[PDB]
Nucleic acid binder design. Structure first.
Lengths: 109, 126, 96, 80, 98, 154
RNA sequence: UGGAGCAUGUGGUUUAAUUCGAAGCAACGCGAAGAACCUUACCUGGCCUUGACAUGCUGAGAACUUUCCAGAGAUGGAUUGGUG
RNA sequence: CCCUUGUCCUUAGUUACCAGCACCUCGGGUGGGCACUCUAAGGAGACUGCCGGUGACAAACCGGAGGAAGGUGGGGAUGACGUCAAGUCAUCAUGGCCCUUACGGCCAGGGCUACACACGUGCUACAAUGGUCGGUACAAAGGGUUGCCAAGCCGCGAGGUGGAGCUAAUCCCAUAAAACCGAUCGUAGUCCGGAUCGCAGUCUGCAACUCGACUGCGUGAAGUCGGAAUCGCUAGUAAUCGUGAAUCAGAAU
């Protein structure tokens, strides 16, 4: 609604804009020409400093539009016999990294 | 006159002592002591010989040291403070040993042995 | 006169045969200018059966020397340029 | 690496029995002797079975392909 | 094998069998002034002009003995040679010092 | 097993001119750089007395007045159970835990500023109502059964 | 060190073709100090009848160009000249 | 006779630059810099040397000078040699059986990680010194006749048409260095978190049709005093800034 979801407070505006994944060096070009001052918050400013901080989300993709295509491209690669879906079916490291038994941040249980 | 060649070294130097009588004026690297050195605790450590020998009012000091890093040559201003002065006289001659500021140390990074990791530090085992 | 050769014992004993040998003939050759040890570090493995611990260590050098004939007329630096070599020096010269 | 500098796939010792197959009807495959016999992106709708040595594989070439080698139809590791 | 060193050593001539049409047609490749109609004549260059033309398939060993490790940028020799060479004297300049 | 160890601490400074706090730059230069540590090493000296009335050393000198145990606990056995030996040691031995134990136990507090953290309990060395003067008397208490452990079978 | 941040580091896992390697916290410094056209660890498409290469008896034509043709794939042979 | 010359040095810098200097853009154009110097080849070098006692006074063991350094500082590929039925009939070797129209033919029609776990465990932290930048006094020399690939026009960050260092006292990776008092709100399994869905982009070049660096952070986490008991530290030691170069075409944790 205001930043996609409910946001905890008493912190930055630029880190209220950098919320995990596409941003800050885009926002380096945003907060220098828009007029939204980083010197205060979402509430220490008035409400009118947020109106173009709300418009920069519904132009590319949405958290539901992310949920829309979180399975659609996955649907392509499961049932099409591929090696993008031989380990997508299996659970392994996929992009040719350290693959077989016990490297750290790729599989889980 | 007093227009002479001393030196002062720590971590691979070859120094310039442009010294004469004056009033304790201290200088380094075509600059003063409070230009590259300052806002750090090794400043008055070389005043501890300069207070030992009351030479903070009787000599004008320009000793230059370069190389290494920032503060590893704190001991090189310490190195040749009286190397320009025991050449001048033997007045402080038998009274300077308690200071202890000339020993060009070999507790350093010498040749690097294979099999070990570092200087005499050893790899991990059980 | 700039040189390219081997070691500490055959180029210094061949630039003994450059300065004096072209000074007796009328012109002047300046003194030998120092150019130090070439510091090149190596690694091998010297074990019969493979033991990455059991390395050894090597090094190799090349000396140069800067001489300069003041008024260039010394033919000895080019005529007796093969006199500067005995078995394994290949002399570089620079006339001037 | 592998950016789109080398754009078109003109390779005459690998071209001359795949592009020529437009005039002749589709009753037979294009027979492959590499793990890397790629062809042009103008020839989607064919059969390339991945050469590796003892039997051939089901390759369902469908309408949308842009990217990389044929190491997914017959995979690298085949789960023996 | 008598015919393993013999079946790969002959690439000193065969990889460089043309070596001039390869030398002329590997320099314009770094130039984009070639036209888009010339995206096919730059690709009638070298390959089925018989395929001893890729330089990717060559490898060195020792000069007398045949070993790929131990080769440095200053020899044609190897690591089981360099212990047996300078000790009889086959290696120049290689003295022991600091 | 002769001891060839030779102790000799350098006690002189161009900033403080102390005794047992001059050469201390070892644990305040936390494996990194002196530039960042210079404002943390001798930045706390004028931060312990900047909150009180007396000088930094005033409550720094009284650290070995309530943080130094009167016994020792080095174990030894003879033919039964291991018995330690506690007795009035030399100042050095007793006065080693009267600073470093008071100093190192400041990570379980950690208020604003790293230099305040180091100076956190330096002003406590006077009244001794902190944590460094809680283990000082504790040491004495664990010596009732060890009281007669020095001569006989020790 | 720790329900655990599922690397061929050997023992427990998945073939329709599988060659030898240590014997302890001296078991991932155990043939060789590198498997890029297989003339390698019998999948082998596949073909030998003299030979790349090591080899004696015999040759048109010394030689190469053998670019290009079947080749989605070595080469024989058109091999354009040369007769040395 | 085996890391082997601040310590002493005749003589030492044809093109570095600026102690003598004028100069300078105070980056040193440039003489002169051998003296208020620029990377040492190699050469007196460090001792049982003396004094006082202890010891059989004798091997030793303590105390001492000089004087900003005076007593011990094994740096081991033909181990001083002595050591534990056991790795290759295999890098040069070397036997009781074998293929022998063959493992002399070779252009090979693909068939090694189901997780069902233990384990040789050996950086990174525990949200607080808090969370996302383009910047400081500021690394920088050689190899370099099928090489390294500037200040690049390309840039947020990509230095592919350019090319000064082309045989390096130049330079191509040529940019740098934990600091000042680093923004607003002061101490938290989160405003440290993105594995299967980087699509798609004029560079090796006859050969990137459902997978590569290309780090823009919208997203899809798990880091809580380390207790059973165990790798392991008596001094420059337990202890957090990178490698320049080919069989002469630039991802050796």
């Amino acid at each position: 609604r205001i930043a996609g979801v409910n946001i905890p407070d008493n912190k930055h505006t630029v880190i209220s804009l950098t919320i995990y994944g596409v941003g800050r060096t885009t926002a380096q070009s945003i907060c220098a020409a828009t007029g939204v001052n980083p010197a205060a918050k979402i509430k220490d400013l008035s409400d009118e400093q947020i109106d173009q901080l709300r418009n920069e989300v519904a132009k590319i993709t949405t958290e539901g539009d992310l949920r829309r295509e979180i399975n659609m491209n996955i649907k392509r690669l499961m049932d099409l016999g591929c090696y993008r879906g031989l380990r997508h079916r299996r659970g392994l490291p996929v992009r040719g990294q350290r693959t077989k038994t016990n490297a750290r941040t790729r599989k889980g249980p | 006159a007093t227009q002479n060649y001393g030196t002062g070294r720590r971590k691979t130097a070859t120094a310039r002592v442009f010294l004469r009588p004056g009033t304790g004026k201290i200088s380094i690297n075509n600059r003063g002591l409070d230009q590259f050195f300052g806002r750090e605790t090794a400043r008055m450590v070389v005043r501890q010989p300069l207070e030992l020998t009351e030479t903070v009012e009787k000599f004008d000091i320009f000793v230059t040291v370069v190389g290494g890093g920032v503060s590893g040559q704190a001991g090189a201003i310490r190195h040749g403070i009286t190397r320009a002065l025991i050449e001048y006289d033997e007045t402080l001659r038998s009274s300077l040993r308690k200071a202890g500021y000339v020993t060009r140390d070999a507790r350093e990074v010498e040749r690097k042995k294979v099999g070990l990791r570092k200087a005499r530090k050893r790899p991990q085992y059980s | 006169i700039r040189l390219k050769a081997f070691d500490h014992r055959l180029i210094d004993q061949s630039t003994q045969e450059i300065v004096e040998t072209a000074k007796r003939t009328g012109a002047q050759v300046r003194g030998p200018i120092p150019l130090p040890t070439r510091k090149e570090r190596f690694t091998v493995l010297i074990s019969p059966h493979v033991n990455k611990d059991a390395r050894d260590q090597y090094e190799i050098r090349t000396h140069k020397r800067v001489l300069d004939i003041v008024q260039p007329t010394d033919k000895t630096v080019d005529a007796l340029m093969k006199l500067d070599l005995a078995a394994g020096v290949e002399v570089q010269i620079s006339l001037g | 690496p592998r950016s789109l500098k080398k754009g078109p796939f003109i390779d005459l010792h690998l071209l001359k029995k795949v592009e020529v197959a437009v005039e002749k009807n589709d009753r037979k495959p294009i027979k492959t002797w590499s793990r890397r016999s790629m062809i042009l992106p103008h020839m989607v709708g064919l059969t390339i079975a991945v050469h590796n040595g003892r039997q051939h594989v089901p390759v369902l070439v469908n309408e949308d392909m842009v990217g990389h080698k044929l190491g997914e139809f017959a995979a690298t590791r085949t789960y023996r | 094998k008598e015919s393993m060193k013999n079946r790969e050593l002959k690439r000193q001539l065969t990889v460089a069998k043309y070596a001039k049409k390869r030398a002329e047609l590997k320099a314009i490749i770094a130039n984009p002034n070639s036209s888009a109609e010339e995206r096919w004549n730059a690709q009638v260059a070298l390959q089925k002009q018989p395929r001893d033309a890729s330089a990717s398939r060559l490898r060195n060993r020792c000069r007398l003995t045949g070993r790929p490790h131990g080769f440095y940028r200053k020899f044609g020799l190897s690591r089981n040679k360099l212990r047996e060479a300078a000790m009889r004297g086959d290696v120049p300049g290689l003295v022991k010092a600091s | 097993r002769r001891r060839v160890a030779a102790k000799r601490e350098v006690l002189a400074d161009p900033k403080y001119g102390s005794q047992i706090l001059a050469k201390f730059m070892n644990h305040v230069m936390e494996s990194g750089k002196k530039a960042v540590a210079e404002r943390i090493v001798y930045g706390a000296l004028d931060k312990v007395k900047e909150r009180g009335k007396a000088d930094p050393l005033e409550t720094f000198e009284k650290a070995l007045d309530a943080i130094a145990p009167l016994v020792e606990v080095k174990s030894r056995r003879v033919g039964g159970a291991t018995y330690q030996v506690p007795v009035e040691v030399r100042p050095s031995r007793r006065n080693a835990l009267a600073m470093r134990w008071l100093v190192d136990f400041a990570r379980k507090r950690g208020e604003k500023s790293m230099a305040l953290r180091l100076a956190g309990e330096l002003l406590d060395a006077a009244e001794g109502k902190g944590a460094a003067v809680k283990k000082r008397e504790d040491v004495h208490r664990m010596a009732e059964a060890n009281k007669a452990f020095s001569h006989y079978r020790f």
